Each structure stands twice: as structure tokens, then as C-alpha cells.
């Protein structure tokens, strides 16, 4: 089980320094290079650079596109690679990935989940969670729809799971919309059997990492 | 830098079709051209490396060819789970550069939405705001019209909607429309309705509730 995981998404102020960590396990990470690639929301991919392996002393190559603002580190005692990008601007808002170089199949054979970093001077705001209860007005051929409304947060993203990860089938976690206030709202809905509404419990687990706000809400 | 240009930028095909995407480099890249598949919200995944080598576990329906400046990626028989954006990537020299990507979408038969409506929660009402949610589940095609009615008066400028990406199993779309009013405004009317019109519906479907 090769695993890569970027540190949590969140805000960076303009002209300040973005910092991320890429925590790895399941392979001899000191035998492979590690790349960083980013993807500006709604745009394509950009290779930022790579850090080499133990044999090469972890020397680096960066894209001239970020020329001089980026450094890439390793802390072998922590199974971690780090990315630092200084003096950020609006252009640096993106989902940042660490991607293993690989050996035969290369480059980028394994990727982390990615971490959205938003450049902004605004303050973070954790969401409110309200239930969308199943009812007669949400009844279709024996199935029932239910969900949770996740409102008034900034910035993206928010993570929603159901029953701590045990419920994944039939879930629709809609793209957020931007409200007039500048805050985002989303709904996450699940269609289940109407017959077991009385015996099964459904809980939406909402995690707005940028604000370290975790909310659990039972949908009755 | 080597610039990579992909074509087309997007396309729609039926399950079973042969799909061919092209990638051109501004200058030679020998064989060092890889292809990645990415689904909305998920990281890219390596499918093919160095023109035509399938990554372990990748289905045999994917393949690639070409050399020098001109390359192709082919899905022999498109499957529903294959909808994504596909990127080419040259790595003969630094900086490594990606194509702009090709979004592969599926056309299928018409599927009507199942419509659900949700009144505002007591919790939210407590707060001072009243959101009413209309859900349209699993329809195709993506084009659909929602119309909010509050005692038969067509509403304007108090709702927001968003549509999902295409489903990887049934190739459908879902849409959520949210009407937001103040509690005060919410407690002025009785019948809150969501009118859905869609190609898979003989006549518009309504879902409403009396406050």
C-alpha cells in the first residue's frame, strides 16, 4: 500500500509563504524522487519541480515558472517531503499534489489526494450543518432521499462523509455555490430504502479543514 | 519549454464507441509521452507511460501510439467509468509539461429525474433563515429547468443551483436547487413548490409542501 498525503487545505495570505507537507508510507521513499504538481481550480496541470533521492543528496529541479520562490525539502525522520512557495499571489491558488517519480513507470506513478490552497486575506469561516430529512415529499418508488445542507463556510473545500465512511453508495455531494456574502454552500444527499428508515441511522460527517471545524449531524 | 497541444478539448461518445485523442508537441519528445486520467475532485492517475506502455492493472482497452511530435491515445470500446479528463505529459526535458486535457463525456438514452423537496430544518429556522431544497436525481441529459413557486407566484432571484459531474456508473446527472428566504419571509406564504421540466418528462413534475 503505497500512500502519499498532502497536509490539509487552507488559506495563505497574499505575499506570504505557502507551506505543505507530503507524508508517505508503504515504500522506500528514500529510493524514489518526489515531484510536486498543482492545478488551479478550473485549469490544467503544472509541474512545479522534484526533489531527488538519498543517493543524490535530495538535490532539486524547479520549473522556471515559479523561479526562485520555491524550495523543496525532506525530513527523513518523519517520512515527509515539504513544499514552500514564497510571496504568493492570486495565481498560486490551486490544488497541490505530491506525486512519486517512480522507477520503470515514471514519472508520477502514485499521487496524493491533493490539497486546495486558497490565496486570500479574508478570514476562515466554518460551516453550519442542517439536516435534509426524508419525508413523503422525498419519496420515490420505495426509496427515500435524505441529506445535509452545509452552509456559510470559507474557503473551500469542505469534506462530507456518511456514517464515518461506511455509506458511499448513492451519495451526491454537490459542487458548492458561492453566495452573495462570499460564503459557499453545498448539499450532500443520499437515497436509501424507505423500509429501513426506522432501523438504520444516517449521520453526515462534515469536516471543514481550513477552519478545523468538524460537525456530525444525525439525519432523522 | 516544450508546449503540448491536445485535441479535441472535449467530446461525447456512446458506450462501446472507439475514442481517439491526439497530443502534439511543439518539438520532438522521442517516446517520452505519458497519459493520465483524472475525475473531478480526484488526482490524475497514470494509465500509459512512454507512448504505449500500460501501467500495471490498466484495462486492455486503453492504448497509445506515436513518436516525435505527434501522439494518440485510444479507448477501444468506451465504458461508463471512463468519463474523465485525459492529459498527455512530455518528460523528455525540463520543465515537464502537460497538454491542456481532453474531457471525455458519454451520451446515453434519456432518463427522467426523480424529484424530492425538503422544507427548512427547525434548527436553521431557529437561526433566522429558511432554505428550501429541491433535488433532481439521476437524469439525462444534463439540461433541466427548475422553477420555484411560493403560492403560485413564480420566484426570481432568491435561488441558487448546482449540477454534479457525470456519474461514472449510469452516466446521469443530479441537480440541487436551493431557495433561500428569511424566516420572516418564509412565514408569509403557505405552499412552497418546485416545478421541474425535463426531456424525460411528458409534462412538468411538481413537488410541493404547505409550510
Amino acid at each position: 500500500q503505497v500512500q502519499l498525503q498532502e497536509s490539509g487545505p487552507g488559506l495563505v495570505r497574499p505575499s506570504q509563504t505557502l507551506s505543505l507537507t507530503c507524508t508517505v508510507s508503504g515504500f522506500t521513499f528514500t529510493d524514489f524522487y518526489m515531484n510536486w504538481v498543482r492545478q488551479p481550480p478550473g485549469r490544467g496541470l503544472e509541474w512545479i519541480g522534484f526533489i531527488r533521492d538519498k543517493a543524490k543528496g535530495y538535490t532539486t529541479e524547479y520549473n522556471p515558472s515559479v523561479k526562485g520562490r520555491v524550495t523543496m525539502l525532506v525530513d527523513t525522520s518523519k517520512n515527509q517531503f515539504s513544499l514552500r512557495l514564497s510571496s504568493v499571489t492570486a495565481a498560486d491558488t490551486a490544488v497541490y499534489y505530491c506525486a512519486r517519480e517512480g522507477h520503470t513507470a515514471a514519472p508520477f506513478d502514485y499521487w496524493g489526494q491533493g490539497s486546495l490552497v486558497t490565496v486570500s486575506s479574508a478570514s476562515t469561516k466554518g460551516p453550519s450543518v442542517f439536516p435534509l430529512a426524508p419525508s413523503s415529499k422525498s419519496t420515490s418508488g420505495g426509496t427515500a432521499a435524505l441529506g445535509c445542507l452545509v452552509k456559510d463556510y470559507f474557503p473551500e473545500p469542505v469534506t462530507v462523509s456518511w456514517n464515518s465512511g461506511a455509506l458511499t453508495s448513492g451519495v451526491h455531494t454537490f459542487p458548492a455555490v458561492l453566495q452573495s456574502s462570499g460564503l459557499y454552500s453545498l448539499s450532500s444527499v443520499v437515497t436509501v430504502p424507505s423500509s429501513s428508515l426506522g432501523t438504520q441511522t444516517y449521520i453526515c460527517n462534515v469536516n471543514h479543514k481550513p477552519s478545523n471545524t468538524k460537525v456530525d449531524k444525525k439525519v432523522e | 519549454d516544450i508546449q503540448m497541444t491536445q485535441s479535441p478539448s472535449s467530446l461525447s461518445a456512446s458506450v462501446g464507441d472507439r475514442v481517439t485523442i491526439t497530443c502534439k508537441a511543439s518539438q520532438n519528445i522521442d517516446k517520452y509521452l505519458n497519459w493520465y486520467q483524472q475525475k473531478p475532485g480526484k488526482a490524475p492517475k497514470l494509465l500509459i507511460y512512454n507512448t504505449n506502455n500500460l501501467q500495471t492493472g490498466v484495462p486492455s482497452r486503453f492504448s497509445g501510439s506515436g513518436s516525435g511530435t505527434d501522439f494518440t491515445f485510444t479507448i477501444s470500446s468506451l465504458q461508463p467509468e471512463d468519463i474523465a479528463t485525459y492529459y498527455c505529459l512530455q518528460h523528455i526535458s525540463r520543465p515537464r509539461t502537460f497538454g491542456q486535457g481532453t474531457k471525455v463525456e458519454i451520451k446515453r438514452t434519456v432518463a427522467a429525474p426523480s424529484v424530492f423537496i425538503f422544507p427548512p430544518s427547525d434548527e436553521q429556522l431557529k437561526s433566522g433563515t429558511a432554505s428550501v431544497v429541491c433535488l433532481l436525481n439521476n437524469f439525462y441529459p444534463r439540461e433541466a429547468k427548475v422553477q420555484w413557486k411560493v403560492d403560485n407566484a413564480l420566484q426570481s432571484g432568491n435561488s441558487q443551483e448546482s449540477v454534479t459531474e457525470q456519474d461514472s456508473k449510469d452516466s446521469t446527472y443530479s441537480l440541487s436547487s436551493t431557495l433561500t428566504l428569511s424566516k420572516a419571509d418564509y412565514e408569509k406564504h403557505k405552499v412552497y413548490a418546485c416545478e421541474v421540466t425535463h426531456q424525460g418528462l411528458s409534462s412538468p413534475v411538481t413537488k410541493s409542501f404547505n409550510r
Partner: peptide
């Protein structure tokens, strides 16, 4: 390792 010529 890498088989990529741009790695080194």
C-alpha cells in the same frame, strides 16, 4: 531509478 530522461 526513474526511467525518465528529464529526472537527471
Amino acid at each position: 531509478g526513474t526511467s525518465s530522461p528529464s529526472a537527471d
